[PDB]
Chain length 257, copies 5
């Protein structure tokens, strides 16, 4: 794939604008955006989380106008949608002290997004190799104790929505040359969410040679995780809470050989 | 079609004003404060009182009558007014320990401002779709479980002061081409306020093509939220505390086709 | 005044170097730099802080070499909080953080503020609680109404007197102050750790977007400061604000005006 | 070595891509990436940590294509911590943060460190407590004296063996290492939250102020790392260090030397 | 001194490389790098710290190659705290953070400070409490008055002796020190986590706004440091300051003066 000149003319550009909903587990008909309450196994070997307790990666494959030319992704604007929902501190949460407001959403967060010309490539890593991941999820198979640090057998494509659990997969840094990805894990049970919004910020997707992701088969791949923290119920039980992510991507036509 | 800027001394003007916060104002003595926060007994029964809900602030400022020319907003200076009030730790708050001073205002904050040539466009998102928002507020209608992450039916304009609750609306990232907005949510009950003031900092409002918000009908729209945290009363009850926001906007005349 | 050219050559520049002591309340002959211990009113309506419990803005007016139209124009500032290491005294009748521990250090709500101007800093009054009774001997927002809790434009003043304007009820007026440059940070929370940087290598430029610094009316330079570092906790649990002095070095040049 | 011109042409560049596994102690066949539970000595004098309780430096010596005078010069690095999302497993024999809550996540003291060099990382020994008896199967500061608690120039070593040099008693020697680029952050405190960023868009340039990167003696590239992310607390409250692997991609070019 | 041109040629540059050990109090033969456990006086007036409980500034005077009019001009600095990983020893007679947990790590109030000059660092005395009795064997502000708690211009000194000038009662004098560059951060709070960065890729330029570095009078370079990292808590709860050494590498060039 030798990359040649960019096309010009009114017809040579296009935009993709959409949102990815979060996939936190959705334990019942009222709990879109939440996981099942989190329970703790008594031993490493008995860790067997329910599917509805596991946040998963979000992904959308977006068809582009049919076109050798390829759409090249050049810029991104992105935003977490609904940040102010975390100000609801009145909905049967757990009072921080006698007569106080409910404890707000807080604790471990993972905020991640990617834009590529093909599926995000994943490497499996597990906290505990004896965790049994549930039916309906796609997970590192044949996990060994080495899978707790690095097992090169665990290679996958993020090719299905609400299927790849966040905790056992990361972007594969050995691959992904045709994707740009960005993430932050902020740990701790008390860490405060810090969520910025603005319509004035643009990320340039071009690599060090001036080339953006090139869309194979005229498809653009967007992926996201926005686990904002956990909601604490009055009882003390805790559920992951997630939010949607907005994407606006500008593309141009690029000739290749 | 945006054409050239008009020059000459007659071609520039300035807007200077402040927006007061709209925190709920539960009685005649409590401007700047919400009603004390109560917690529902069940998730489904969440039903906040109007005076417990901080709302977006908005001001529409009339500009010198033109006429096609339009005022174009170019720069902003902005500041929270009265940051030092949070040093009042002697006004029947809750002692941090025996014989100590009162706990200062702290916890969840939302600091937000926008400048636009028309009303800020809003997208509704709710923490809990079974929350009953109260009479006298404008809130996402026909909320469903999908409203907890993204329901595109919930579109609105910030066109009325003390009416749109902060917790269920955000700037719509799919619109707002003629507005510049900026916000930060910092969550957590112990989050310290960090408030900077200076008259030496300017934000440039021009987009990537060198064009600022263009003021339709010669009106400038300013919006803000500055929920600084919660004040904790001696009894333990907690009220949101907000402050006013200063705006200085410089505008120039722009020809459009 | 139209601002014309800068004057060059011998005697066309000068420097001001000084320090401003903090005004925290000074409740007795031994307690310069501290406030009185903070007490809490029994009701919201009855808030009535004693003068010696209220930190105040510091101000100094510095006479410049007499001119004459030429005016002194403030171009750069170096500034520093003086005595930052005093906060390492954790052995002087404080409250142990746990059994056998060192004393809790100074921490909690801070306000670090400084300004340089060619005239008095202009202030806007805002009060946490409009029914607070501010004490005799302080200058405070008069005829406060419930609107004063958010913004009452009647409360305009000049920082024209030292140890008089309480920090908690006045801020720089952003609608004025065109001939002053001001900078401040409020960091709230009872446990916030002080973070205090010192260096003699950092310079702030005071020139506005047109290349013009504060122009000193009557050949006087106005310097203002607040450096409430936090609270000291006594063994008994009582808390006192603690402040430190601020150093200023300002370079000025002569500017012709019409 | 006098440094002369860079070689050009298709054959003049090469790249190294690999990962280094963490070496946290691996106390049993199920606990790769963890240390043994941390125990506390009764006295300073009796401090005597078992090997499987001591995280160690990771190192790989990577042979490069043979050249011989030309040397491979390391010019850029991309690096990443692998498996950051594993820390979201808060359902696996941990300790509930409060009644009915999720498990306490990995948190507390972290050290994130990496280096790229044309020879082994040079180390200086420094010990918290000179009376610590370091265990069989580790390489540690020898003939430690009280001065070893601050600086004893006898403790010089090379990071030349994997899972051997304990993190707590060795640092990069700032008096040497001119042919290595190293970077590290120790973030202390028992409750500090991990903050782990990932991206494939960030490059670090390895060139010094003269435009010269590490030069690979004998055509070997030396990569070193520590990524102690914090401690995992199990249900009983016992704590174990948890580490993760680090990815490296290094671009190199041929450089002539005399 | 009128500053004229820089000398060039291979012989016109030199380097100083060294380390300064911390001076934390060293209460016994086994506790180099630590202070005595911290105690708390029963009244503000009775504060009377023992010498071994007080960290002091470190200083080294480094002779340079003899010149005479030429002076050595300090141009760049690389500096690093040595032994950051020692803070990973959480198994040595500390206090478990909770049942079965590891020892609480070094944390709480830190002061990290360094300076490079062509003469002794100039100090200003400021005291937390003017009634503190500083011990024999230290050099401290004399004839302290209540004003010494904020600024008493009598307390001027030179940092001209090791193990002598307590950190808590002296700071760099911002009204002087024109021939020195100094940098420091006080981070307060009993639970503040240490954040210690190491790298050999970072250089600080020591030139002022006129392109002139410190000029070394009598061909001596003066380096000063404080690196109080926090406090170590022993099993009983008693707390001691812990410090680490600091590396300095300074590049100098010959400068003609009149
Ligand atoms: C306290 C408890 O039993 N927790 C169970 C959980 O039980 C459900 C519900 O508990 C809560 C909770 O965890 O505190 C109430 C809370 O308001 C809910 N929050 C939200 C945002 O929806 C959560 C949440 O739905 C789940 O945790 C998600 O997994 O649920 C109980 O109050 C409820 O109690 C019923 C009794 O079981 C029943 O005998 C009696 O007739 O009626 C009461 C009241 O309805 O039961 C709920 C389950 O049916 O269930 C989860 C299962 O995922 C766990 O077992 C928790 O431990
Ligand atoms: C303690 C309590 O009853 N709290 C009620 C609250 O009652 C009001 C007031 O309480 C406080 C409080 O919440 O602690 C006192 C506090 O100083 C106030 N703070 C400020 C900044 O104004 C708050 C605040 O105004 C409200 O929380 C705002 O929503 O209010 C009580 O002290 C007061 O008690 C009176 C009795 O009602 C009355 O029978 C008796 O004769 O006199 C006492 C003393 O005046 O009543 C206040 C209400 O009238 O009310 C709120 C609802 O607004 C909640 O019900 C709290 O739970
Ligand atoms: C314990 C007590 O009675 N406190 C009241 C106080 O009495 C003081 C003094 O108490 C202390 C205190 O704990 O508040 C002792 C402290 O060491 C001292 N600290 C410093 C830095 O000076 C403080 C301080 O002087 C005041 O709090 C400043 O306002 O005082 C107590 O030991 C002694 O018996 O009487 C003293 C009064 O002369 O007084 C304050 C107001 O002045 C309050 O009334 C306290 O409740
Ligand atoms: K299992
Ligand atoms: K309801
Ligand atoms: K009153
Ligand atoms: K031993
Ligand atoms: K060296
Ligand atoms: K004394
Ligand atoms: K001076």
């Amino acid at each position: 794939v030798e990359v040649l000149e960019v096309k010009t003319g009114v017809d040579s550009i296009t935009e993709v604008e959409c949102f990815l909903t979060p996939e936190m587990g959705d334990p019942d008909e009222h709990l879109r955006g939440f996981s099942k309450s989190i329970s703790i196994s008594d031993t490493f070997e008995s860790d067997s989380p329910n599917k509805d307790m596991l946040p998963c990666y979000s992904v959308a494959r977006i068809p582009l106008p049919n076109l050798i030319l390829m759409w090249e992704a050049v810029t991104l604007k992105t935003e977490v949608i609904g940040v102010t929902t975390l100000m609801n501190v009145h909905s049967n949460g757990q009072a921080t002290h006698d007569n106080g407001a409910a404890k707000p959403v807080q604790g471990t967060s993972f905020h991640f997004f990617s834009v590529g010309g093909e599926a995000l490539e994943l490497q499996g890593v597990v906290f505990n190799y004896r965790t049994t991941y549930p039916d309906g999820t796609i997970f590192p198979k044949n996990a060994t104790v080495q899978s707790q640090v690095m097992n090169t057998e665990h290679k996958a494509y993020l090719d299905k929505n609400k299927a790849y659990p966040v905790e056992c997969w990361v972007p594969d840094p050995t691959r992904n040359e045709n994707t740009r990805y960005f993430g932050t894990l902020t740990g701790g049970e008390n860490v405060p969410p810090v969520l910025h919004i603005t319509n004035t910020a643009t990320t340039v997707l071009l690599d060090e040679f001036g080339v953006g992701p090139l869309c194979k088969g005229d498809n653009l791949y967007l992926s996201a995780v926005d686990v904002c923290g956990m909601f604490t119920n009055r009882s003390g039980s805790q559920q992951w809470r997630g939010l949607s992510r907005y994407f606006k991507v500008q593309l141009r036509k690029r000739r290749v050989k």
